[PDB]
Design a protein around this ligand. Structure first.
Ligand SMILES: CCNC(=O)CSc1nnc(C(C)C)o1
Ligand SMILES: [Mn+2]
Ligand SMILES: [Mn+2]
Lengths: 137, 137
């Protein structure tokens, strides 16, 4: 029986600028770095950055909607999004609205998101404005 | 301050086979579905499947090392891997490190992993036998 996410591994093209992005800009905790990777944490999340020469920097218009969202509180959301914009972090666009979210790209074009709210809150919101064809179990 | 992973969204080419894989084969809980997506949970992980015409069924040789690992106990590991093998699920890598890992593909070629063990256990192993260039913080 599966119990949750054990770790998320992102392939990166250059290790140093990616470590700087996740640690210095996003504030994640750096535990270890070596010649081909780094281990960080964000609360319960174990994030691994893995140096991969096959990673290409892809424009958001030509990558799919696969994305990774991080939790932030209502009180910090707007000021954090503002800090990312002031630092020149690029944005991307999703096809639909899923609540209070800010969409931004990492240096390799991984699609990231800041989101306020839990799954339970999302389901309650969707009961009032559902997506087309929505069924609840 | 970010507090953890809020949700993981995977782009899928066909909703029905992906729901079948995550819900029925992997045992995640289906909370809702709509014409272009579904919400599931696996422990404290909120997983979104998003139907995306841009998603290609991607062979493992054509994608980078980005991958998603799910937690499982050592006691359950071998029988879960055997279930995947009976269902015909492809493997994209052999485990060559210490620690139990099984590396398998979803129907669209997303790279998945079953892993036993935490970040703390990995850091302890690396302190005894560090990777090339490894520094701890
Ligand atoms: C499967 C259940 N887990 C999730 O809902 C992940 S996001 C999440 N979980 N708690 C929160 C707080 C912001 C209330 O946010
Ligand atoms: Mn999202
Ligand atoms: Mn892994």
């Amino acid at each position: 029986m599966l119990s949750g996410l054990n770790h998320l591994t992102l392939a990166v093209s250059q290790l140093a600028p990616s470590v700087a992005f996740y640690q210095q800009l996003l504030g994640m905790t750096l535990h270890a770095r070596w010649d081909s990777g780094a281990y960080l944490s964000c609360g319960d999340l174990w994030l691994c950055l893995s140096l991969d020469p096959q990673r290409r920097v892809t424009p958001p218009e030509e990558s799919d909607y696969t994305h990774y969202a991080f939790s932030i509180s209502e009180a910090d959301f707007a000021s954090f999004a503002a800090r990312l914009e002031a630092a020149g972090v690029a944005v991307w666009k999703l096809n639909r609205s899923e609540g209070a979210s800010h969409y931004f790209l990492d240096p390799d074009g991984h699609k990231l998101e800041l989101h306020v709210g839990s799954l339970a809150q999302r389901l309650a919101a969707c009961r009032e404005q559902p997506y087309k064809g929505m069924v609840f179990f």
